[PDB]
Write a protein that binds this ligand. Structure first.
Ligand SMILES: CCC[C@@H](CCO)COc1cccc([C@H](O)CCN)c1
Ligand SMILES: CCC[C@@H](CCO)COc1cccc([C@H](O)CCN)c1
Ligand SMILES: CCCCCCCCCCCCCCCC(=O)O
Ligand SMILES: CCCCCCCCCCCCCCCC(=O)O
Ligand SMILES: [Fe+2]
Ligand SMILES: [Fe+2]
Ligand code: NA
Ligand code: NA
Lengths: 506, 506
């Protein structure tokens, strides 16, 4: 984890304030020691332009995509940023108004390609994304925009999430609504022929939908060597309002009675498994990690307890209020909670009415009912009052899809990011890093090249630190063992909020 | 909290072995120093005779009631015990066989009054009880049996729990099935006329039942200055099989679809409040404490996650198995979990779809649905794998029904009691006391008489220690602050399992 800090000075407003791009990199002023093995680029996306002249964007996910880069070499750091030249951005600069409708901002007189959320590798290319059918190829060294790619030209999905899984050979998996099913897309690694791997995309498996005409909102999914896990939540997209001045936010509604349905598919045999896993209602944005343990799937999730859509609390006008009002507005919101679910793969009918989770080191349960639903209860890993452990990250390259111990997160305090967190998912111990009037971003883990343990490395986070007598922002490097500060690299300009990113080793 | 000990020597079997009563008190040999302010009697009930000749009792709750007493005066301790002369016991000694059917043992050729569970004060009298219509007046100084009282002679209930609440003026509240509703019985304090307060008992309020013909099993309930809280679980008593060689165990079944329904009544206005609180399925035996905080009831519970009846795992044949087998048999049982539920008393229709729990210090939620059900999620206070925090006790005289911080419990390890626990319900910190091959009982808290703080006192537990090179049993006194040992008083005979009891100050 929880925060130990209030924010009466209101400096978090700087997360939502327009900035200018740079024509070339700035030096960042280092205190402490940037690790000498840290060589590469931290790339992150977020909104950077929150109005077009006098026409405002309304929602957190509406501002125009800005691509950020911190470069690390021989203990020195540079910072650079450029707006992504999407259709939405280019046409707004051309027409000097809002041209394309964004998530929560209707344009007055066409799907947005405003790639403000994340960036990921496919073959030798990098793509910025949002959650629509459009992803944007970008140059990871210059930050120039290369092209728009319409996924519908290649595979049958209406969009895809900003959280594809990336196997170590470069294979990319993602999930998207299909207008009704949810399809898993597979993009292969770059082959010797050197054709764009996107032209070899295919649907490998399909998940069913709980409601013929109302697909659930899907933000992420789970992946192991052998299974795919999809969590169908009660936040629904109303297709009647969707396909007919509305925005994307206007199409969401909450199904009160379904709870949460969980789904697994066999990855290698490409087959849906008809096990009716059921539990109580929550919103889910981020899976933490998933893995197999004696024919149970361990599913670690960042949950929000309730069926109301958490995105209702993320209009900019609400996030820009003073601190007492931010706290008040969050009082009726779903409560965040880190939960471990355990999914049995071997359902014996003779165990009807009993708990199937026979593993020795969990309190998660799964009860086989007579109608063949399997009712699940979680083991709670972390819970604090309006204190979200969010934007989770792990040592992904070595522990993604595998038994693991540690997650890192951004701690939200009534939605305001104000700390960095580490959770031991076996012992439930936590570690916190936090300073007054400091607003971090998602932490990204980078392994030490000679690592023996899971947490032998660092996390990188971009921190907004307003108020005079500090420079406006900095790159923070924490030791992953205990979250103690190893270095920071201060820059002389503001940085707005960023969502997701990656570290590109060079 | 969890246990750090295995039990391969199997000494826990001594909890379930017949003992002989004493004709008068033994000296208990003190090591350490019994506090000189500790003056009174620890009175406890449990089974003491587990067969009648060659006819065995089968279930944990079948053995013949044995009343135990440890006396404390001027740093010296005595131990004494006598079988309660119930109908079941007297008629078994007379006929030299099992005459009355017990909970899980059918008698071959009449409701049991085998008061093996608890003892409580009414007026100037003490009653041993089970959960039927019969309670047994006993002498707290000599342990003689005085008389049988049939509650049906006085009030309209078919039985009453072994966990009545006792207000500071001596008023006694209890709950019982009525054959369908659940009735709250009120027994007044002793008045100046000095008539038996049981003759002035009355039903003050009635709770509805979820199923016209199947009442829920009820073990305890919650009480605050202003409210009564009743938790209706999915463990049902099948009245068709009940009123028709069956035993009590044969009448239980699990409702798979209802989950848990929670109910509140206004204590002072004697009125049921029609708020449809709902959550997922669990067994509940023991409420920990209940209290009011602004317009919310805080309901702390010892839960078992699942709808299968936990009593199925408590046949003596299963509890007498070797350790590897005990662990295996408990693998499919419901998982124990301490949970805090928060119940809103102010339901505004305008908050439909939202979380009503606006308190600042909890992650529990309550969601108002369109059908007017209020779906609840708990804040988990403690959770360990088959590690139950059970038989909870608090500083009841000063904090029962009130805001509080500390609970004490008996820790079960795959159902085997092997440790004592303390839980801070605000911070979730725990403390443990445990020794190898030592099987404690429910801890009872006794305040220093001049205490101003909540945990300024001791806990007492009866410990069975069958390891050779130790005496067979002892009374344990721990400091309530940190569960460090203050003293123990060893006795030279075995003591079987005991369930509940009290400390009678003198
Ligand atoms: C009606 C919702 C449609 C789904 C796509 C399914 O085809 C999501 O659509 C958008 C559109 C614009 C911005 C976003 C943002 O990425 C969200 C926040 N991460 C999502
Ligand atoms: C079919 C169940 C009936 C209910 C009474 C409802 O009027 C409970 O009945 C017994 C009978 C015998 C021993 C017990 C034990 O006290 C239980 C565990 N404490 C309970
Ligand atoms: C750094 C962000 C701070 C302000 C917004 C935080 C509220 C987050 C709520 C949970 C996660 C929602 C998903 C957002 C990330 C994404 O678009 O992928
Ligand atoms: C000291 C008891 C140890 C062996 C039995 C432990 C199993 C307890 C399961 C949950 C509590 C069940 C209710 C027992 C107390 C009572 O009858 O009031
Ligand atoms: Fe995300
Ligand atoms: Fe009990
Ligand atoms: Na600090
Ligand atoms: Na010990």
């Amino acid at each position: 984890m929880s925060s130990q800090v209030e924010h009466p000075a209101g400096g978090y407003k700087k997360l939502f304030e327009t900035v200018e791009e740079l024509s070339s990199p700035l030096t960042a002023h280092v205190t402490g020691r940037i690790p000498l093995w840290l060589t590469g680029s931290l790339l992150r996306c977020g909104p950077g332009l929150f109005e077009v002249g006098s026409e405002p964007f309304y929602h957190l996910f509406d501002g125009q995509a800005l691509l950020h880069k911190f470069d690390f070499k021989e203990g020195h750091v540079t910072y650079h940023r450029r707006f992504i030249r999407t259709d939405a951005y280019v046409r707004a600069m051309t027409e000097k108004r809002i041209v394309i409708t964004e998530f929560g901002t209707c344009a007055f007189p066409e799907v947005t390609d405003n790639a403000l959320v994340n960036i990921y590798p496919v073959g030798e290319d990098y793509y910025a994304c949002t959650e629509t059918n459009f992803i944007t190829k970008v140059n990871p060294e210059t930050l120039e925009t290369i092209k728009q790619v319409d996924l519908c030209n290649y595979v049958s999905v209406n969009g895809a999430t900003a959280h594809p899984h990336i196997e170590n050979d470069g294979t990319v998996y993602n999930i998207g609504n299909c207008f009704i099913a949810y399809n898993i897309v597979k993009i292969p690694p770059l082959q010797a022929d050197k054709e764009d791997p996107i032209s070899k995309s295919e649907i490998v498996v399909q998940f069913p939908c709980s409601d013929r005409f109302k697909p659930s909102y899907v933000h992420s999914f789970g992946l192991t060597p052998n299974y795919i896990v999809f969590v169908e939540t009660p936040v629904k997209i109303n297709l009647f309002k969707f396909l007919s001045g509305a925005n994307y936010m206007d199409c969401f509604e909450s199904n009160e009675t379904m709870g949460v349905w969980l789904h697994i598919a066999d990855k290698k045999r490409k087959k849906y498994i008809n096990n009716k896993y059921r539990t109580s209602p929550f919103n889910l944005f981020h899976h933490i990690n998933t893995y197999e343990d004696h024919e149970f799937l361990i599913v670690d999730l960042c949950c929000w307890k309730g069926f109301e859509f958490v995105y209702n609390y993320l209009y900019l006008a609400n996030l820009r209020e003073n601190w007492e009002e931010v706290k008040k507005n969050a009082r009726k919101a779903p409560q965040p909670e880190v939960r471990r679910y355990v999914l049995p793969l071997n359902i014996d009918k003779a165990d009807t009415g009993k708990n199937l989770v026979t593993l020795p080191n969990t309190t998660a349960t799964a009860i086989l009912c007579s109608d063949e639903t399997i009712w699940l209860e979680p083991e709670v890993l972390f819970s604090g009052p309006r204190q979200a452990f969010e934007f989770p990250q792990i040592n992904y390259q070595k522990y993604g899809g595998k038994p693991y111990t540690y997650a890192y997160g951004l701690g939200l305090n009534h939605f305001v990011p104000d700390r960095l967190c580490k959770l031991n998912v076996k012992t439930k111990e936590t570690w916190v890093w936090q300073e007054p009037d400091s607003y971090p971003s998602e932490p990204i883990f980078v392994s030490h090249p000679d690592a023996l343990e899971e947490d032998d490395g660092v996390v990188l986070s971009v921190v907004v630190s307003p108020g005079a007598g500090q420079k406006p922002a900095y790159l923070l490097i924490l030791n992953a063992k205990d979250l103690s500060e190893v270095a920071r690299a201060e820059v002389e300009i503001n940085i707005p909020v960023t969502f997701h990113g990656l570290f590109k080793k060079s």
